[PDB]
Design a protein around this ligand. Structure first.
Ligand SMILES: C[C@H]1O[C@H](O[C@H]2[C@H](O)[C@@H](O)[C@@H](O)O[C@@H]2CO)[C@H](O)[C@@H](O)[C@@H]1N[C@H]1C=C(CO)[C@@H](O)[C@H](O)[C@H]1O
Ligand SMILES: C[C@H]1O[C@H](O[C@H]2[C@H](O)[C@@H](O)[C@@H](O)O[C@@H]2CO)[C@H](O)[C@@H](O)[C@@H]1N[C@H]1C=C(CO)[C@@H](O)[C@H](O)[C@H]1O
Ligand SMILES: [Ca+2]
Ligand SMILES: [Ca+2]
Ligand code: NA
Ligand code: NA
Lengths: 686, 691
């Protein structure tokens, strides 16, 4: 039996090969079982060689320590400490004359482990049939979960016992453009859990590279989660060549929910930055967009309503009749540029700028876009000239309609077109079933594609925000030009019937573990019927809570998603969106309970200014704030953006108060969050 | 109810919708049934009745028109091709699904082409083909010259059998290959060649295979009906379609004279006209040698080093590896090939194994297998370019993909730019192994898109393409004449892997060569492979004279002399035919042809009065009584006959040949005997302009 302890001594891992030769581990935190005895291993595709899960012998083992500090290009703080004790075990399989290494890294806030496959005579090329990584639970915990799916993460969270997942799964799987649920007890990572004995446990992975995306399948009789990888077109779960490594599997654990949010285990298990000049060109982006028009149905992506279908290079759009709904027209874009410039925004996104949108949805169309040819009413050169004159950058849009070979064929030309026309950031998308047909969004094949697009973008000094991509696993450390994904249910679904009131009190515990989200907050007119009378969707938020998301939904990429006209009605509240920073020297998690409330204070990078947000669930929240994180002796202008006493997400969402006063490190504030409400505070040094 | 006749009146097509509403056609030739009543149509993938595009049709309208125009190939068997047909177009309406299709029939003096057309309409836009149900109902139990139906290889020896015997012979006919997916006990590939008991020759094939899955044939051996069997994708579907769109043409070439099957240009005539405006200014035939046979025979390696199990490109440091002393693609060795090419008037030298990755290329389903850009330490790209240019030689680029197709596409613009930057204007590509993306086949719609994408992009760089393991050609060279080659059949390489059947080159022109030329790589003089590699006991099933014959009987604008220079140096008298023979022709005459037995062809070298003749013979040899009526009255010629010696034989005495020079004219007569697996070659050079 091998033993490993955290630097602070509070976590203990034990490892042994069991009587069947199965590698086994367990984990305790302050004397409480976190992971019961759990087996590790893989089954390989047949060409006893299929068995890489038992008949192992422990040949050697070592423990080492590591302690270094590094600086993110952008992040929640200036400096991250990477401190762990490491156990490496060398496991030999006599029957197959081959060895693997299992590497365990134990931090004060949890455990990472991975498989390593050394180059040897009897292990070179192999295909994974299944990974059999176990996470044996000590009880029937509360879980905050979305359905296990190879193609979408755009689901509302369910809060239930592990025993209740099976019964709730059918109702949890709501309609989506591309979805492949795999099990009645299948869930996605990161999975958040709360134990009856007062522990918070997060199960996830780190550095998902050259490998298939991991989901979890629950054995709900023994309460064991098992790794369930995403299959390819032939049902296989990864083409490997030694030397190679699995991604890390992570268990983040604390008796304080705030320490789950504070964990940097995911980033710490990724390889250091591989972009030498990163600081010189990678910058956070605050943006508005020609976007909400089309999401609500007020406007169209399409130029014309005249065409049943289109053939790019044959269809002559100059001979088609404008539908009068096409939001991506030069005059309209210039009005967005004016509003962006007046209010200190960095960029304007425009969607529907390019030929093809008439056919974009659900046709499995190969040649669906060229990412190069503007519609007749979108003047790329004039918009570039005008934006540049107002100190604004345009954000490029590359919806692929999940036609991935087509995107790859155009990708160098599309990136060159961006550079030639003054675009340095792109929002990509993968809406529809993947082409090549038979592949899923999160398979090894597509994971390669998403990273290929990011690596190539880095060579062009382009920042990437990829919607519908595999959810992040901390690769932003290695490639910091990946400034965003959606890869979860965003504000767009507030237009498609609504998100659960508690949604933004769960995402920071689940989706945000591994990288930021382009959540597109800032909807002030929460009734979608004001954009489109046929749309009766209502945003499950107060205005004050929308302001809070600029602090509680961390991202270097922040949209103000509403139309300028709606911001002009509430410019007093809009001041918080104008003021709030995108990048931070320090973050303090003041209050956190998944599904109930999140309160975060952040120090704007290079300043002594602080920003606070609180987001609350179905029953609201009461905060008793203290400000001992402020500098002794310094006075601050505090602006509190709060729910009015009669505010409510459903009955009275636009009821807010704004109060300015002098604050210091001795100040105390008691604040009430409405149901689906919250508050925002700017704290600017005098 | 609808009738169409050939321009000359010898062929009659009838079309009617049968009682089930199934479109039906038949074909007669000089009063003989060629195609019995045969149904047409498709089954579509379910999103009940909408899946049915095979019956419940009504004949809505029809017209007959005539067409007669002549066009000039960039390269070909003749200067001019006549495109003359009568056309029947039928509009077929399906009331139950409120949609129409068009079936278009083109009837020539030498056979029939038909295709489906899917017009843009309210009720037909995006659809997926489950199966095509194009029937070819045979009049009898014909002799067929066939290879196994397969989604991934055509590298099979031919079988000659009755249609009734195909089922019993299929298992024996499927030999081991790097990538193969046979689909049916009675599945065969196209072009399929047949000989009837009532004196007819019938060829079944397709033309203009674009944005569609490759067609094979599946035999109903109880009713003797062949049916279209398309290549499935990774999900088992057989084509993603968007109206307006067309199927490829399906062709029935028929004559009572086997020579008229070879003479048919129906395949080329059914392709769209040339889309490369400046084609003549840069597309040129290529005669080449190669650093190649060394590696095929096992004498040399593609690999730089023997020290590595596997490689990681960009990590593996080849400057730290030991040269294996067998690596043929080294600067000094390549320069010696350039010297031989330059001295003997060849256009190009192919080099394989020039680039990092060959230590770890074969049958691993490896994604990042090659970069098409980084030379081995012993191959100086820049020095070889300078040296080749100084000797008036072009280097032919090699892009083996190891069937890793996304990887090739990601590199393709950079790889073509690298070619242009370093003076390469032609590329031999390859797709050895199971396709990546995994689940796709070599001949599916997905890969057909890839191969044509590679050709279209090459055209923009003024690059000519020779693609091994690609879908077999269907006349697209008319549209994109920079496609100067495919293998896409069993080539000379298999003469190193145990041998080709003696009769192989008497069948390929009736089958594989219908739709475009083959890079067959003829010209092996040292037919015992154990002289290259003692461990290799394979023998080429040929005499030397028959190897010379293939430069005329295996038509291609791309011709390799495949042997090593030192082997040619031992038989330079015979090598003179390979030096002299043209690559491009103003006229071709098929003098003698019987599939599986013998082919004799005369060709007039483009822009000249010079003629070249080849005869290739099967297991029993052949006797020719040649006449020369095709020569110009009054003109005298120097004829050089390269023939089998009296005691020549492919197995027992393959290197026994004679060379006889004499004066020839249009009244000359020559009686020649081809040995078993033998043949002959004749250069006929007009006396005044002789060189
Ligand atoms: C625009 C949106 O379309 C799809 O959303 C559908 C929902 O999945 C369904 O539940 C149902 O309500 O209909 C919705 C509309 O068809 C798709 O699934 C989403 O992922 C998609 N969102 C992306 C598409 C865009 C266009 O390029 C972007 O504007 C947007 O920001 C993307 O996130
Ligand atoms: C080189 C050759 O390899 C494969 O051939 C195998 C045969 O299929 C088997 O029957 C058995 O005998 O082993 C042979 C060697 O492994 C493959 O199937 C062929 O298609 C392949 N030929 C191409 C490969 C090349 C390398 O790029 C070229 O040199 C050659 O011209 C290609 O045609
Ligand atoms: Ca989306
Ligand atoms: Ca081959
Ligand atoms: Na309240
Ligand atoms: Na004889």
């Amino acid at each position: 039996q091998q033993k490993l302890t955290s630097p602070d001594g509070n976590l203990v891992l034990t490892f042994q090969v069991n009587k069947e030769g199965a590698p086994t581990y367990d984990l305790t935190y302050k004397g409480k079982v976190v992971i019961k005895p759990s087996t590790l291993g893989l089954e390989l595709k047949k060409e006893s060689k299929s068995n890489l899960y038992n008949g192992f012998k422990l040949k050697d083992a070592q423990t080492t320590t590591f302690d270094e500090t590094w600086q993110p290009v952008w992040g929640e703080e200036k400096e991250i400490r990477n401190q762990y004790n490491e156990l490496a075990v060398i496991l030999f399989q006599p029957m197959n004359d081959r060895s693997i290494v299992v590497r365990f890294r134990l931090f004060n806030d949890g455990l990472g482990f991975r498989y390593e496959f050394p180059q040897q005579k009897s292990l070179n090329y192999f295909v994974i049939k299944e990974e059999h990584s176990q996470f044996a639970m000590a009880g029937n915990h509360i879980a905050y979960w979305i359905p296990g799916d190879y193609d979408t993460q755009e689901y509302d969270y369910t809060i239930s016992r592990l025993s209740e997942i099976r019964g709730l799964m059918q109702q949890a799987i709501t309609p989506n453009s591309s979805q492949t649920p795999f099990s009645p007890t299948g869930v996605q990572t990161a999975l958040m859990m709360k134990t009856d004995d007062g522990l918070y446990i997060n199960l996830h992975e780190a550095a998902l590279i050259d490998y298939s995306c991991m989901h979890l399948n629950l054995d709900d009789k023994n309460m064991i989660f098992e790794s369930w990888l995403t299959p390819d077109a032939k049902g296989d779960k990864g083409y490997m060549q030694t030397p190679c490594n699995s991604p890390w599997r992570t268990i983040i654990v604390s008796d304080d929910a705030r320490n789950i949010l504070a964990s940097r285990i995911t980033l710490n298990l990724n390889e250091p930055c591989k972009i030498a000049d990163a600081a010189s060109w990678i910058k956070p982006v605050k943006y508005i967009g020609v976007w909400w028009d089309m999401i609500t149905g007020k406007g169209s992506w399409a130029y014309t309503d005249e065409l049943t279908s289109v053939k790019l290079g044959v269809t002559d759009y100059s001979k088609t009749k404008p539908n009068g709904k096409h939001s991506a027209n030069t005059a309209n874009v210039k009005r967005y540029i004016d509003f962006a410039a007046a209010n200190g925004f960095d960029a304007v996104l425009v969607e529907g700028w390019n030929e093809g949108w008439e056919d974009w949805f659900g046709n499995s169309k190969d040649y669906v876009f060229d990412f190069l040819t503007a519609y007749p009413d979108f003047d790329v050169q004039e918009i570039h000239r005008y934006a540049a004159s107002k100190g604004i950058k345009m954000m490029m849009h590359h919806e692929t309609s999940a036609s991935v070979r087509n995107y790859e064929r155009h990708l160098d030309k599309a990136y060159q077109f961006m550079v030639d026309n003054g675009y340095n950031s792109v929002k990509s998308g993968y809406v529809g079933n993947i082409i090549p047909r038979g592949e899923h969004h999160y398979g090894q094949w597509m994971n390669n594609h998403y990273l290929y697009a990011v690596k190539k973008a880095a060579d062009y000094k382009i920042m990437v925000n990829a919607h519908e991509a595999t959810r992040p696993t901390g690769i932003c450390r290695t490639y910091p030009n990946l400034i965003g994904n959606e890869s979860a249910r965003g504000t767009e679904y507030e237009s498609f019937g609504g998100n659960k009131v508690y949604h933004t009190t769960i995402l920071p515990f689940t989706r945000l573990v591994g990288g930021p989200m382009d959540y597109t907050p800032g909807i002030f007119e929460t009734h979608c019927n004001q954009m489109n009378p046929a749309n009766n969707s209502q945003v499950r938020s107060t205005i004050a809570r929308q302001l809070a998301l600029y602090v509680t939904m961390y991202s270097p990429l922040q949209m103000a998603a509403d139309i300028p006209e709606n911001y002009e009605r509430f410019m007093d509240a809009f001041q918080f969106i104008k003021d709030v920073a995108l990048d931070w020297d320090k973050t303090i998690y003041l209050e956190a309970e998944p599904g109930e409330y999140i309160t975060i204070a952040r120090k704007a990078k290079g300043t002594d200014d602080w920003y606070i947000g609180c987001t609350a669930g179905e029953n609201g929240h009461d905060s008793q704030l203290t400000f001992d994180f402020l500098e002794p002796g310094k006075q601050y202008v505090a602006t509190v953006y709060a729910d009015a006493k009669d505010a409510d997400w459903k009955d009275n969402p636009q009821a807010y108060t704004i109060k300015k006063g002098i604050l210091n490190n001795k100040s105390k504030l008691n604040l009430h969050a409405a149901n689906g409400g919250g508050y925002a505070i700017s704290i600017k040094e005098v």
